[PDB]
Amino acid sequence: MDDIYKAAVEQLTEEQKNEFKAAFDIFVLGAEDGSISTKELGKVMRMLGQNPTPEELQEMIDEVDEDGSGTVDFDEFLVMMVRSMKDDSKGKFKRPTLRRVRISADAMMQALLGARAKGHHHHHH
Numbered sequence: 641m642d643d644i645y646k647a648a649v650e651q652l653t654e655e656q657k658n659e660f661k662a663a664f665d666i667f668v669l670g671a672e673d674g675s676i677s678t679k680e681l682g683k684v685m686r687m688l689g690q691n692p693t694p695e696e697l698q699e700m701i702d703e704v705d706e707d708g709s710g711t712v713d714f715d716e717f718l719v720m721m722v723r724s725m726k727d728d729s730k731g732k733f734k735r736p737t738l739r740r741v742r743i744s745a746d747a748m749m750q751a752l753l754g755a756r757a758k759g760h761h762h763h764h765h
């Protein structure tokens with residue numbers, strides 16, 4: 641959990657936090673810990689059209705899980721979304737060998753939000 645990523649979470653207004661909070665609750669649907677785990681990840685990813693395995697699911701969480709928690713909480717959840725945005729938005733550093741996982745974090749949110757097709761006002765974009 642980098643300070644920059646942490647700041648990004650706090651940089652979110654009440655509406656922004658509320659919107660993400662809703663996704664978090666859904667993400668951890670049935671979660672005993674309340675954090676996004678492999679079980680929750682698999683279900684969420686399944687909706688996105690993915691079929692990752694438990695080992696793969698844990699790896700994903702590990703991507704945003706810097707504390708070695710093993711699960712993605714509210715902090716990691718926002719960080720994961722911010723991480724992707726920060727990349728295209730900035731993409732500073734960029735280690736060698738290139739980066740993998742072209743999965744769109746925004747795309748996942750759309751699946752999680754659902755809304756019977758009409759996910760939020762289309763005018764918002």
Ligand SMILES: NCCCCCNS(=O)(=O)c1cccc2c(Cl)cccc12
Nearest residue numbers: 676681700701720724727741743745748
């Ligand atoms: N531009 C960097 C993209 C990284 C952000 C997304 N990472 S991801 O492995 O594709 C991913 C997608 C959806 C849910 C995830 C969760 Cl819940 C945890 C870790 C990674 C996840």
Ligand SMILES: [Ca+2]
Nearest residue numbers: 705709710711
């Ligand atoms: Ca954690």
